[model samples]
Every structure is written in structure tokens, then in C-alpha cells.
Target: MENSFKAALKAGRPQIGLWLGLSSSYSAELLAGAGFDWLLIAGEHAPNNVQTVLTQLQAIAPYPSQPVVRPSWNDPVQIKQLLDVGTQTLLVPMVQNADEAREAVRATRYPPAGIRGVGSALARASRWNRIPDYLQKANDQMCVLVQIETREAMKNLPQILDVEGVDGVFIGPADLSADMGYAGNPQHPEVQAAIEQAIVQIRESGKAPGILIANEQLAKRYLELGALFVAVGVDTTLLARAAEALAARFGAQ
Candidate 1:
């Protein structure tokens, strides 16, 4: 029942991950065995709800790789529901500063430690109240990762890092690029510089830095710069690109 991914993040260990945009429990199970260190259940941009996420979680349960869920926004209700469904590591989106970061963490905790509602009777988090002392022990295993995806978030990165309980910081280059006036171009020099600097700062802060880079070179660069949990690709993109390439090769020419 130990949250290994949370443990690794705390220890600053490097972990490679993938973006699960397809939102299929069957596909999730297939990719879970593809040998990635972790997989992201993208709830923000991808079409995902509590039920869909729960299905993917159930499918991914037996795999050795860990699952990280990203809620659409920094909403406590969504966080509470995701946690109730047994997501230990969360990647919260659109957190701008330390206060937002603290709020994200508070949503993950119970009572004095946090304000997560009590609902163990109908929750899988405690295995239907089967895990002994579930409430007392649950707080320590939760991992809260905040997304730094906008100009304001980047400017406040240091302050966000200072907030306690934020185990990892993920730089969402897509939104960040657009916010920096470089729409559709995450490779712009300015965006890359900001990302690289943030990675180093996050690493130096004794917290895990994370990112989702489809380009091998960029992903490698970020990893070298100290991005501990790096997601290399998206399930949808991989499927479409590969299928298209195959059709093009076999097309009547």
C-alpha cells in the first residue's frame, strides 16, 4: 500500500512517464505494461471524469509502473474525489503561487492536517475502511505535484517551491509557451530558457521537477537539467503518428 512514486519524488529519483490522453482503460492496461516508470491520467485537457479515472486506475493497479492523475484545475472538490478513488500522486494544474500551492496540499489532507472531507465508508482510499488507522496514516502517503503553466506561475516559481507539501513541480510547456507569446512553439529560445532555469531551481530546492516533452532532445535536455519525473509522449499522438506513417509508406505511389 506504500506510494512508491511519492517516495521516489521525495528522494529526487528520476522517473520517465507518459501522457494518457486516450482515456481508455484497456489502452491504459496495455501501456502500463510498456515498461514506463509512470503514466499520467490527464484529466485537465483530456476528456476524463472521476469514473473514467477510476476505471483506468483499476486497470493500472496490477502494473509495476505508477499512475499520476492531473485534475483540470486546482479544485479541492476534484482533488478530494480523485483521492477518494485512490490516487496517491496528483498533478494539480494552474497553481500560481505559494498560497495556491498550500491550498492544493490542504485539499489532499484530512482534518487539522488538511480539509479533505470524510467519506471512507464509500471510498476506496481506505479499502472500504479496511486499512487499519486509515485516516491517521493516509496523509503521509499523499503526493501533491503542482503545475507551473503560465507567466504568473513561472514568475512565482520560487515562492511556489517554498510552500510545504508540494512534493513535485511540473512545468507545462504547451500553455507556458502560449502564455509567453510563443503560441505553438514550445521550442522558442525564451521558453526553453525559462523551463531549463526552473528545472534547475526546482532540483536545487530539494523538490522533484517534472515535465512532458514529446521531443527526444528536449526531454533529454530537461532530464539532464534535473527533471525527475519526465513524460515523454502522449498516447493519442503516438497512435496517430505511427498509424499515419505506416499508411503513408504503404499507400499507392
Candidate 2:
């Protein structure tokens, strides 16, 4: 029940991930063989539910690229369902402060360590209780990655970084930029400065720092700034841009 992705993050290894917004198992399977270190199944901004995410998990299971799921919000119910569907790594969104980050971690664990309901026997996470020592070993394999996306979250960055059970911190540039009054502009000098500073701070805290950036130059800059797990592109954007470019090249509308 070991999670290689989580282990890599703990070792401070730089991992490149892709954001899957297509939400189809076929697309997921195709991308699984694309040689990324990890794949993010976007349930936050993309159209995905428990069942769809489960299928994507199944489709990605055969590949070496680890699957990290992002629930729409930091709600425990969503977290519980995602975990039950056998999600080892979770990227919970909109975590504003330490308490919210702690709650996100708690939702991933069981009983005394967390508030996650005990139902492994009926869940894929335990393989219907077929897996040996499922409950006992589950916590160690679970990776909790919280998203820092707002001005408030950046304000409380140090405290949020100090929370236990948080394996990594993902900086959402778009949301943070928007929250900083620079909507749709993550490349603004102020936004980039804040993001870069946060990356250094997160790395210094002994927790893996992460971010999603489509720009090659900026992605490299963040990686240089000590971001461990970075998502370089999104599936939807990749497909749309390529298709549009191809159409224009072919002299089609």
C-alpha cells in the first residue's frame, strides 16, 4: 500500500505532473503513458464526480504515473468519497488557513487521527477488506496536499505550512492572482513575486512545494525556486490550443 508519489515528495524529488480536465477514462489512459511523473484528476474546476474519478483512477492504475485527485473543495464528504474510491493522493482546494488545512488532513485519516468514517469493507480503498492490514497501513500511504489559492492563505502561509499530515502545498496562481486584484493575470510582477516568495518559504518549511504553470519559462523558474511537484499543463488547454493551431494552419475556420 505504499504510495510512490508521496514518497517522492517526502524525498524532495522534483516531479512533473499534468492536469487532466478532459475527465474521460480513455483520455486518462492515453495520458497515463505520456511519461509524466504524476497526473492530477481535476474534480475542482473540471467536470468530475465520484464515479468518473474512480474510473479515471482505474484507467491510470496500470501506468507508472501516479494519480493525484483534487476534490472541488475542502469538504470532508467529498474527501471521504474520493478516498474510498482508492485515491492515495488528494489535492484539496481553497485551504485558507491552518485550521482548514488541518481539517483537510483529518478528512483523509480515520478515527482518532481523523474524522473519516470507517467503511473500508465497502470501499475500494480496502479492496472489500481483501487487502492485508488495510486500515492499519492506510494512513501512511495517504498523501494530503492542500491548495493555497487566496490572499488570506498567503497571509497565513507559515501557519498552514506547519500543519501536520500535510504532505505538500500547491500554489494556485490563477486564483491567487485573482484574489490579489489581478484577475486572470498570474504573470503580473506582483503575483509572480508573491508566488516565488511563497515557493521559497514552502521549501524552507520541510514540506514539498508545488504549483501549476503552463508557461515553460515560469515553470522552470518555480522548479529552480524549489517547487517539488509541478504541473506544467492542463489537458483541456493543451487539446484546444493544438486543435485550433492545426485548424488555422490547414486554412480552416
Q: Clashing pairs in model 2?
A: none
**Per-model TM-score versus the true fold:** 0.96, 0.96
> Tens-digit lDDT track for model 1 on 1-253?
6899988877778999999888889999999999999999984444557989989999999998899999888998989999999999999989999999999999999999899999636688898888999888999999999999899998998899999899999999989999999999988999889899999999999999999999999899898888999999999999999999999999967
Cα TM-score of candidate 1: 0.96
Residue 66 shift from truth in candidate 2, angstroms: 0.5
User: Residue 136: error of model 2 in Å?
Assistant: 0.6
- In order, the Cα lDDT scores of the candidates are 0.91, 0.92
Q: Which stretches of candidate 2 lie over 4 Å from their true place?
A: 43-48
Report lDDT (Cα) of residue 202, candidate 2. Answer: 93
Candidate 2's clash total is: 0
